[PDB]
Amino acid sequence: MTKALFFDIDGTLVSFETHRIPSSTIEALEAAHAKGLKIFIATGRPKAIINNLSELQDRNLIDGYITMNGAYCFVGEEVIYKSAIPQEEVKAMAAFCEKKGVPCIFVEEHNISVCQPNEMVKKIFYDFLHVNVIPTVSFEEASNKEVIQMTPFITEEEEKEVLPSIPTCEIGRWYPAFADVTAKGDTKQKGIDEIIRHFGIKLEETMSFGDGGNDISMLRHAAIGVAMGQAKEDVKAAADYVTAPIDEDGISKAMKHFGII
């Protein structure tokens, strides 16, 4: 039976339409918590920009975090796993984005920076997602930092063009306009493995929930993968179960279906 729940944030817990968590999702997680489910976040966001979970956090419902697509995982105050991108690949992404004229975010353990931000950074991160403005730094300075995640604002065509210069990194998307890049093997699947190692939970006892391409590995990896009803077809196909759309009680309905609650 299920012991650990892994939730993506954007499009899974938090609606892109309303920018809020559905009330029935909060009630479902309350009920699961009391039954002893462990509740984990599994997000491409770095901690620095997780500004949309206060309802869950203030209710003390979250037992641990997988952030930066698995490249930075912690339980309470304790970091249980982290990684960094090979510096050659950091440099090559910075050079690519600078030449192409596209912005890129560079995330360190305790700092976050953006290089050559444009209005699409503003339109998506600040105005749509209400993320606090990220400080600007030069590509040169960013290219020398110890980087856990890079988030280039590149198309899928630009992604194919920079792929040979990030030969070992993972790349995935939770939103079409940008991608997240992390070191070899660092996907939300890695995050699940680290969290369940910490708690003595078996893979066979896990359930994941997601809406995006960066959820596919964890939808496949968990014993039961749940795709949100509005997810694209390839996300749905990676899941075991497709629930209702987020704003039609999709999380609660899935949890009830399985008898989690």
| Total residues at interface with Mg ion (CB under 5 A) | 6
Residue (152 or 212) nearer to Mg ion, CB: 212
Site string for Mg ion, 154-193 (x = CB under 5 A): --------------------x-------------------
User: Do the annotations mark residue 193 as ligand-binding?
Assistant: no
Q: Which of 200, 249, 201 is nearest to 226 (CA)?
A: 249
101-128 burial: b if 16+ Cβ within 10 Å, else e: ebbbbbbbbeebbbbbbeeebeebbeee
CB of 100 to Mg ion, least distance (A): 26
Q: How many residues does the chain have?
A: 261
Residue (8 or 186) nearer to Mg ion, CB: 8
| Residue 98 touching Mg ion (CB under 5 A) | no
Residue (84 or 231) nearer to Mg ion, CB: 231
Single residue of 5, 6, 10, 14 touching Mg ion by CB under 5 A: 10
| Residue 211 touching Mg ion (CB under 5 A) | yes
Residue (10 or 249) nearer to Mg ion, CB: 10
Rg of the Cα atoms in the chain: 18
Stretch that binds Mg ion, among 3-11, 96-104, 139-147, 243-251 (CB under 5 A): 3-11
| Residue 152 touching Mg ion (CB under 5 A) | no
Cβ(21)–Cβ(14) below 8 Å? yes
Q: What's 133's DSSP letter? A: P
Stretch that binds Mg ion, among 88-96, 118-126, 164-172, 206-214 (CB under 5 A): 206-214
CB of 212 to Mg ion, least distance (A): 4
Cα-based distances in Å from 131 to 2, 49, 163, 204: 33, 6, 28, 36
CA distance 129 to 114: 16
Q: What is the CB-side half-sphere exposure of residue 237 using CA atoms within 13 A? A: 4
CB of 142 to Mg ion, least distance (A): 25
Tokens representing residue 152 in the block: 């280039």
Binding site for Mg ion (CB under 5 A): 8, 10-11, 174, 211-212
